[PDB]
Amino acid sequence: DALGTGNAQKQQDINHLLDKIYEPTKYPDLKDIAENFNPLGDTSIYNDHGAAVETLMKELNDHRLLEQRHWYSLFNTRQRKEALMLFAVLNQCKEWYCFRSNAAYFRERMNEGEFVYALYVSVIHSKLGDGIVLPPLYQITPHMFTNSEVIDKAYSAKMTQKPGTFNVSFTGTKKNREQRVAYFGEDIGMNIHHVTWHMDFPFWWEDSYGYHLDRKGELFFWVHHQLTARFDFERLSNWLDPVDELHWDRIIREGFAPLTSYKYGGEFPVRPDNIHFEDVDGVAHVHDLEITESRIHEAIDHGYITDSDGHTIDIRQPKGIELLGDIIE
Amino acid sequence: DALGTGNAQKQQDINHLLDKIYEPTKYPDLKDIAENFNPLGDTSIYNDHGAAVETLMKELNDHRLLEQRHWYSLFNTRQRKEALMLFAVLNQCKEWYCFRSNAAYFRERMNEGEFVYALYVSVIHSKLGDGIVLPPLYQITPHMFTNSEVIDKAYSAKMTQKPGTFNVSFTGTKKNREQRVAYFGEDIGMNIHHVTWHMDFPFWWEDSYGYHLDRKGELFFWVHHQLTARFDFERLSNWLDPVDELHWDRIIREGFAPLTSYKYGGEFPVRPDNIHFEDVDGVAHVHDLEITESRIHEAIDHGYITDSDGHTIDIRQPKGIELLGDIIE
Ligand SMILES: *[C@H]1O[C@H](CO)[C@@H](O[C@@H]2O[C@H](CO)[C@@H](O)[C@H](O)[C@H]2NC(C)=O)[C@H](O)[C@H]1NC(C)=O
Ligand SMILES: *[C@H]1O[C@H](CO)[C@@H](O[C@@H]2O[C@H](CO)[C@@H](O)[C@H](O)[C@H]2NC(C)=O)[C@H](O)[C@H]1NC(C)=O
Numbered sequence A, B: 001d002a003l004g005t006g007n008a009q010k011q012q013d014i015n016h017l018l019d020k021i022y023e024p025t026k027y028p029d030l031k032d033i034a035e036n037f038n039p040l041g042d043t044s045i046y047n048d049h050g051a052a053v054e055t056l057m058k059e060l061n062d063h064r065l066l067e068q069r070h071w072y073s074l075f076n077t078r079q080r081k082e083a084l085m086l087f088a089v090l091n092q093c094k095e096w097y098c099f100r101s102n103a104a105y106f107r108e109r110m111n112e113g114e115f116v117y118a119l120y121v122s123v124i125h126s127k128l129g130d131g132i133v134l135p136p137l138y139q140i141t142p143h144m145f146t147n148s149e150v151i152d153k154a155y156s157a158k159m160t161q162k163p164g165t166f167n168v169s170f171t172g173t174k175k176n177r178e179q180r181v182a183y184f185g186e187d188i189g190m191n192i193h194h195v196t197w198h199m200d201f202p203f204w205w206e207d208s209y210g211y212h213l214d215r216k217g218e219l220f221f222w223v224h225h226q227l228t229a230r231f232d233f234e235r236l237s238n239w240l241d242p243v244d245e246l247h248w249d250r251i252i253r254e255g256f257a258p259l260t261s262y263k264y265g266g267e268f269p270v271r272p273d274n275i276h277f278e279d280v281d282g283v284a285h286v287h288d289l290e291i292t293e294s295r296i297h298e299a300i301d302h303g304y305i306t307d308s309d310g311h312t313i314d315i316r317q318p319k320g321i322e323l324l325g326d327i328i329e
């Protein structure tokens, strides 16, 4: 800050914050902040009177938040909850003084993915983040977007201190699969949009956060219909045939080995091909889906979605397809 | 009687009644009653004006009631109906004169299990049975509770008239199974409670019989959750792992051979292990369960049970779990 704004400031601040992210920061201001600040002494910066801050401390305190240098999926109901607590502080800042402070204070003792994930969503949705452009995920946390080989090649570059660029590969045994329409899935661009798309309109949004995203519902319907078409075309251009729809009662015919690795975490598990779906402990039962899919499918077939009271809310009308997306994603 | 009560009377009467039960009685009063009485000549003893008596005679008459010396399960919709007709006579007696009469008259030409079963429930629920303690099932009809070997050993004792006690065994090839947590299932005590529990609050009760059992519903929820925990603990103490929940789409992995025999009836059938469930003629289809289980499971999931009119009766409240038990057992 300029005990405020700029943007080539706001901006600077951000680049510092997501610089070497798997290691304590090297930018000194970020550290005395990191040390000196107390998110709890002038609940005023906070439009909540700092209930959000006060909740994260509580957890950082009982030290019940996920550890640093460990992995993180946004599909973990707790990891998510923790990542999203950071979003609610950064969210209720009146100005840069409260953001930098917090993403500095926190950056330094909350885990990286919760952190990477909170800083981005926050920058994207909060009032205070206008001027900024976020660096591309692919360069901030490259392990999610580069291969496993280039990663190891880069680890060696570093061991030996001799530089240089390595050329990446493509997945399976090209000329042996349908890792022929790979160029599409594996692109750092689509992978970027896919993540952004869902940071722009998150599945977890409540309108307490501030405004309402408009038709995420159709927006969900549509974005995916697009990747599914866009995908189906590439498979056309490759003498391949449109894709199979998946069912829970059948084998997952087509499995792959991703060859990708986590930074802290191990390599991504692989899937053998012609496998039978198993009931996965913790998440949900396979049949649990099969019934979900029917409750779904009956709302489409009935003409109405029925809520909690047994109210039937009609969907044979234009808002239709969006109440369906709210129930389906 | 004392042309009534006592209890060391009521009581006596009962012990006479369930004495050698697979054979006509040897206590003379029980027999001239047995012969001389007519449940139909002083409809007055009866608070029904003897519609109950009058219904059993009707059936004993067309001789359409189950035969004597034959088996009986309480799961047979007719056997049950016949056993429960005895309960409704014994039920509407104004005094001992009507009970002894009937369980004497009947004891002697209705089948034993319908009889054993009616005398007990009747003694347990009817107004007139206060003073009594019932003998333990295990000694009145030992075939349901002792092994097949001890039974045959006792048959020999008898053939030869040389007495004595035999030591019973435990089931499969102990040190070969999970007939290691046998001591629990096979105990004459738990087996006694299990039967009593369901005689105290029967699945067939209507409140016409006289009063309402209070929360059989939660009472059902709970009693079984208890045997299931109590069981799960014993399997802990045996290096065994908590039990598998059963599904209709899977094999019944764990089968057993009971080695038990009926008195009149043959030995209990056995089950081979890793078998596939078959649709059993007469009872119901396997899928018939699979849908039942979903109708169930949707009431839980919806928030309401829906009756016959399509009334939704809410269950997200404290009486909750008991309307669920009324629909589930
Ligand atoms: C990776 O593919 C690139 C294409 O960008 C190759 O880099 C080339 O290096 C060759 C040496 O044979 C030069 O003739 C080209 O001018 C290079 N281009 C940049 C059109 O560097 C590279 O050879 C591949 N392999 C490494 C086996 O980097
Ligand atoms: C059944 O087990 C009992 C344990 O109650 C055994 O009865 C015992 O008989 C032995 C003879 O070896 C005596 O030493 C014990 O005093 C008995 N106890 C009653 C502690 O009788 C019996 O041996 C077993 N078998 C029959 C192979 O009855």
Ligand SMILES: [Cu+2]
Pocket: B194, B198
């Ligand atoms: Cu039971």
